[PDB]
Amino acid sequence: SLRFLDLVKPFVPFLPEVQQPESKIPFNQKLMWTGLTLLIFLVMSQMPLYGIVSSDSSDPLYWLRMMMASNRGTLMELGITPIISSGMVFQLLAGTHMIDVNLDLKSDRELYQSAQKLFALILSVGTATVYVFTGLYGPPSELGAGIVFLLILQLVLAGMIVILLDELLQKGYGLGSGISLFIATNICESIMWKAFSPTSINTGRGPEYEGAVIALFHLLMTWPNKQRALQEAFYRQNLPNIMNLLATIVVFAAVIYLQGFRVEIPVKSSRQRGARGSYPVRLFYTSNMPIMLQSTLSSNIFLISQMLYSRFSDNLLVRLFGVWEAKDGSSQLSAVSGLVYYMSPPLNFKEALLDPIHTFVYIAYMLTACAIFSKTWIEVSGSSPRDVAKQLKDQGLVMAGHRDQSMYKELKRVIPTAAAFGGACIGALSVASDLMGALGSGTGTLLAVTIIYGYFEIAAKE
């Protein structure tokens, strides 16, 4: 809700902030800083935590950590959930005028930015406390009060470092944003680890390798029966395989093809004869933004559901809202019934075939929520048809044979339809990809492709 003007005001001097670049950073240095932030993010994502009594307790974000750039048992356990949560919340509130913000003032913008970073910090600290008290690495009783505060310190300062790295990237020292950069990094690293992991585990046959391509090599190189070797390598359950590789490749091609879609509005420079050109309106007008917004909302809802179930599962409200069960063969909880179950994705194609009504409800929720998120996002950000017409007028672009009002009418025809239907199509592609089962999440592959395209468009400019 709105404050007087803001409540953060006393906190402002206490918050650290990276200095904006005093001069235009050259593109070589932009790439340098981006790569350095890449390396530190990877190191933190792989460097394990402390106090780990055991890594076998239920994780409330099992299906969303790789999607939100988090790895269990490492410094990147926080991911960027506080970042996107604070962002989305503040941006939506400011764009719909729930809060008394006046973004024309630079001081007001500074207060708004400080509130965003501060709220991200509170979100980090709160989810860290929830994690340690729910005991993702051993129960607090076995941990002890001397080590839980240590764990809180590591998680807090790791989230703080992530906040500063994202701020570093966003303020012009690097390319794009830390959110998208880290998400794409995690997805790509996880996917080719599943493709080429040299580690081995003891299955019923013996030591067998994790990577699909390595298994494809070894099975053919050690089995005289080529047909049996291929039968294992292609369809081995509970391990990555060439069928998942095919799913990844085909979803990559499909998302690239669909991303290539855009409607070409014929425009013209008003100060030069001829010079006809086109303004593109992509089918994925918001790119992966609706998916990211939905993923953050779902992560928050899932966390609150799992944390409520640990203390109030007896009550009828909690189970009507969502039911978690620890299915056989694993301690990981999963949604079985309730609204959270219907809003949760199905496990696979065959499993989705086992519940037509649940799949229908989830698909409807996906399409509707993604379309609504995109439609609200284009108006929250400066990308409504009004803003697009303003930008075109500022650039001095016109439509031949039309007035600026006709340009705006055409933009009203195209842009909202583009946003809504592209959000729906990205939801449908996410559903199909997760159904078809890539190495990582099919939605993860979609996110990786879209973020790579966005950074390519940034790189292209410079």
């Binding site: 291929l230 039968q231 292609f234 369809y235 095919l246």
Partner: peptide
């Protein structure tokens, strides 16, 4: 077996297409 049928169709199409492409590119010269 439906999976075996899918595997055989994929293998036939995949390997025949690679063979045809490599043919037209390099072996067509000979």
């Amino acid at each position: 077996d439906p999976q075996i049928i899918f595997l055989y169709l994929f293998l036939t199409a995949f390997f025949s297409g690679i063979a045809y492409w490599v043919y037209k590119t390099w072996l067509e010269q000979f």
